[PDB]
């Protein structure tokens, strides 16, 4: 074993083998043990990974997620597998089945949301299906007939209920909704979250990942679970969250993803003759959230800032989320060049100690940087994929290719890790993470 | 869709996806519906297909098969999945659980055997494991410690009980044991099988494959099931089969496979310091069955003949089994050149109407040729793989490469069919056949 | 015998082998015999094909072409190789060395121009160089230092002498300047070219390509050569050509390429700190010619029209030049969607009889279509490459990938043909055409 | 900057680009500057590298080499290019044109020989040709018609003049004839070469490779050039060399290659109906030299020894030549297993400090090992290729695949180095070495 890496064909085979191994039947777990249920934006990436293998099964993945959509349009971030234990907080802790008027009737789910990457998976499914012939196109088109209305209600819930003041940015009531639990982005907002009488609990996550340097701290978990108590006390009522929640942030990365997803979904709606009023609403939201992202940006570097709604203060941190405007567009030409210089330079992809030319979750030169600790440093394959795909859509073919090339180099150990140590390449988090396999499958072609 | 073929990475991913989809837990079905249990030589090819994906799981496949080995050493050709229906004849029809003193205690199996390709899978597992590092080598070596004795008992049962007169050829008591149910090889022997009072039955196979041109006939099935009645009447007693069975043939292709497998297993035994008496016995059987194969051969073309033990007559047919001596070696140089000329010329791989340069199961110029009918014509990916691997082991690197190249071209539609129409390339038999996916995975590397 | 196609590695090897074989030392011929000299836009694509093999030799190709630049900035379309004949019209016929005040010294050239794809080649060279480390970057940067001013003069001459009315479109004085000698685009303009006493001549092109269905007619060559007589009579003076040329057309495809090239060169100028005044002029021209292209388009379909300056008439034809606006952008959203539908539908890439999903030079349903006859119908790999690269730069990643995939499929016979029959795939024109090899090399990566 | 390695397609392209760049027209130089002439066994490997690009040009390479064959059948090791200097000793130093009765007319050559790998190149050319269809087959068959007799005379001269005692081993009169100028194999024989008055000279090789650690010493060159004086003094007469040469050794590696080459050429002769008497002689020589190689081997390890004819002493050294019997076969089973264990163990491919699992020219644990110094330790791609091809011909498919994989990994920097430092992988010797490019081209397929 002078070189432990796999060839492209061995790697693609092992990624497909993994994805089928994590398939419970109609949903794919995000990982074998650490995340043994369906997560919302993981499910979108899993559908992308399944599209080269089975358009029918990729569609089933999104059908299963959309069957758990709330009555008001929200897609919740966890759809729990029936009778499966081992993730905390579990269905009993959320108590949405009893408390939440809008929760679905034949599914157990969480009570918060996650980024709307789902339209992007729909586009990848359609692109695959169109290369495969008439009966496969029929399958993808029947999915659109079945779920276009549900996708619209999802986008409409985000635009009307999480952007109540039409600022063009998505408000979050939990850091988990950003997809980045312990990102330095949320530290000053979480410092203003003071738990009251928090019901006793024991973590499950650090029983599986026992190295304490790779997961959040107990104090952070106390704050994560307290926010659940605040939502539960108002029975997850959208109208009441602004009045009671101790955590209210506008997430600029989520907002930029939503801008892209609206434009993607509008293009799908035009291609497939969906209602014109829907397409118009989608294009309107795409531009509003593009403008809302650009309004946050640093006047010199173009870097995007999150916003603390309770403190009424811009949140200035050095994480990958600063590059949100690169995803959706809209910066003045001059400022977008400066932002690309930031991305490629020694604070991020050009840092000289990096093993791969990839985007660390937090800049290695930030004092918040921790090379092992979840979203505080490590390189995440899922972010590499999203940036590469969005860059290709901006027309930046060579930038997209370079990220794909380094992403595949990093993944060629076959660990399919959740995230990787930025300097040594050590695989961290869960092994056999479904969306890492999915990124590899989509890249390999 | 100007071209429906998959790239090598898409094809490898789809083959791995298939193999995991056919995994019931500790055994892989030979196909989803037509063959919903474990078959013996399929299980060996499945282990070859799993070795690039998981050495641990490839080992489990062979452990599961060897746990169904009979007390006298026989590996039976079907290990039935618990509580699974849809294949006939099923466990009730065989009745080995009640009738057969040697049947295993916690497994339902058939009562006949199949070709000993298992040593070849063990070699592929070891070759993969040695590229993967210390803990993976440990897994493969623990399997050898656990099952070397069982593999020896398998080879010893074949050599002592199916070659009672030490002729160096394996006697079969059912055409199913050849792996080629309806091969023209067995027609004259089956014409001497006269069913008595055969208990009523309904076929299951042609409920799944309904095109009558792709499966054997009802009259052929009557003979297949009558031979079961003859074995059952003597309770599957090895000592009594020569006295009662209406079908007794020496199978030269099975014999040549056994010769190769003995030499492969002896080399493994030397590499891993197995008992010297075992290695010596294996080399002895390798040479005896090589000599027994060569003794059947046509003096002009080198083609190998099967032998009808009851009629005491050589069986002269034009099938791929004629090329048995190419697998094990031993022909005089002159005659092996003539046999290769036969293989490559217009009766087989060089026939001008073939879509791919592959070996049809029956020569297209034989009057027995039927282009759709199971073993009477179609091109079988499993045979392509076996010939290519044996050719590479003879040192015929370019011949092996050409078969691999045409095999991958044929499989690039992604149907993973059981067999293919030789002229049009139409996929036939079951789709999603496990050993076809396994061949592709092993070839792609 | 069963599959004449090459593997990607064999095809890449043969493409590089061809490019080196057509290298005369400091210039590469466009083909071995039909085009045994340097052609201007072929040299740009050749530099693109050389960049993965040797950045130094790619730079030499462009240095050689630019050493032949006219004193007013024009890049002539042929740079003749020393002492080579076999192409007509050759240097004696053009007589630029004796007649043209602006012709270079110590190079022999034609007296007309060709499309400005050169900036695209510079970008590909720079992209390759930045992946190769310090010494290779220095070679490419030194080329910029040495040739930026010549590239500016080339673009300035197009913008100021071939768009003297600031309409944002390039005027041509010969069909050869379009790169598409016999395109139906020019038929109505050539119909008004009436030759006088034309000095006699013998074609060389149809001594080499003898099939008369594949090349222009004698009548067409008479008009081609007559236009030369008109230019020669005014000593190729820019100020006098408007007064005397019988052929004056605005070429919308050339104009779109110029817009793209100006934008590409402007971004290079910013990245490498070229003078601000130059970058501002390049962005000004990029916008002007983008607008000039859009001004030609059909309001329903988006199809771009050429313009006959002498007849003052829009030239409405059904060729791939209609798709000019897709290259440079600028169409309203609805009109660009309509133009893409035209491109993908049954009149072009969707035509049911096409062997590959590629853009034919003329629509197969046009009365002007001739499937073998040069630019009147065949599929040209150079156009496939240019459309796929421009599409990727628009962000249309899947559209670009499909063109690349089909172009590679078409090229996989290894003929490296100049163009291909659109229905049968028969290779046509010259074999061993340098820019077809270059496209393959750039695509295969 | 993060990964200097090339993709397989880029590497294949660059290898072909190099081979065409070293083509002088009808001969290919072994390197651009260090070896600016045709070398005999390099030309064979070059023909192998050309065969995937152009069977016609591969045949031309061998035609050129054979047009330089001596009248007695010897193929000389250098064919000098017209009017090229820069290699010493050059044609003036050899003086074969004036002194050697058997030297060719209108070619300038050296006066010594080199290993007979040529038949292997003929087989690869034929294998490629048979995949390309009728006209390409005709080119390769016409080469056989034209050159079979010259190939027979080459083999007959080796068998009759360099094995005059029918011992089945080839006698050399210069270390250069082994292809391994400064191998430790020859140190004790060179220790008895005492030069007299040697006409003065200046090396050219170490003007080009200036690092003295990478080339032989001045003292060694004095002995090399003195042996020339001894040959010249008897006008290169075969009958007189035994009486006068101070260096006479039987080369067991050369002998094994000759055995393989005789067997390969015999099979070609049968396939293409060459005269029966020739094929019988080739099989006779194949067996004789197989036996002569085995006669040298250590009875415990199988390691093959060279033999010093003057000292009448077996030459016991630890170089890759010890593995000669693995190429040609003939060892008893137990002895060959022992020799493979030596090859794979810590003295060769298993040494823990090696960067790649490749065969070093001298064992790193030998007192004679020097990691930079030519044949005293470095890893040579040409040996990797020759071992992997011969291993595949033995049927050792996995052993051949591993050597090919590691050789491709080592070559993936694109230096195409003559040899590589075994521990660091630093490229050494000449860059752009033609037979390293040829090995890559043949491997990549
Ligand atoms: O949401 C949580 O409770 C834990 O979140 C982690 O696991 C999820 C599944 O992989 C992802 O969706 C998140 O992005 C990741 O940070
Ligand atoms: O044995 C049977 O009852 C039916 O046999 C067919 O199905 C089996 C599973 O694929 C194979 O093992 C045989 O080779 C094939 O002919
Ligand atoms: O027909 C001609 O005499 C020359 O024109 C052809 O050859 C040139 C070299 O390939 C190209 O530059 C043109 O695009 C192509 O049309
Ligand atoms: O050192 C020298 O003067 C010549 O010898 C070297 O160059 C030749 C061309 O590569 C090879 O034929 C030999 O194998 C190699 O040893």
Numbering used by the authors:
A (entry chain A), B (entry chain A), C (entry chain B), D (entry chain B): 2 to 446
Give the exact sentences the study uses for this entry:
MhGgH was unable to hydrolyse GGlycerol and GGlycolate, despite their considerable similarity to GG. The structures of the E419A variant in complex with both compounds and that of the D182A variant in complex with GGlycolate were determined and help in understanding this behaviour. The most significant differences from the complexes with GG/MG are observed at subsite +1. In the case of GGlycolate, the glycolate moiety is found in a single position in the E419A variant but adopts two different conformations in the D182A variant. In the D182A variant, one of the glycolate conformations is close to that found in the E419A variant (direct contacts with Trp40 and Tyr88 and water-mediated interactions with Gln115 and Trp177), while the second conformation of the ligand is stabilized by hydrogen bonds to Tyr88, Arg216 and Tyr375 and by solvent-mediated contacts with Phe89, Trp177 and Tyr222. In particular, interactions with Tyr36, a key residue for active-site closure and organization, are always absent, while different subsets of interactions are observed for GGlycerol and GGlycolate. Any deviation from these strict interaction patterns will result in a decreased affinity for and highly reduced activity towards the compound, as observed for GGlycerol and GGlycolate.
A glucosylglycerate hydrolase (GgH) identified in M. hassiacum and found to be highly conserved among rapidly growing mycobacteria is likely to be responsible for the rapid mobilization of GG accumulated during nitrogen starvation by hydrolysing it to glucose and glycerate. The MhGgH monomer displays an (α/α)6-barrel domain typical of glycoside hydrolase family 63 (GH63), to which MhGgH belongs. While the active site of GH63 members acting on larger substrates is located in an open, solvent-accessible cleft, those of MhGgH and of MgH from T. thermophilus are covered by a cap domain (subdivided into A′- and B′-regions) with constrained access through a narrow negatively charged tunnel. The crystallographic structure of MhGgH revealed a homotetrameric architecture, which is compatible with the oligomeric organization of the enzyme in solution as assessed by SAXS.
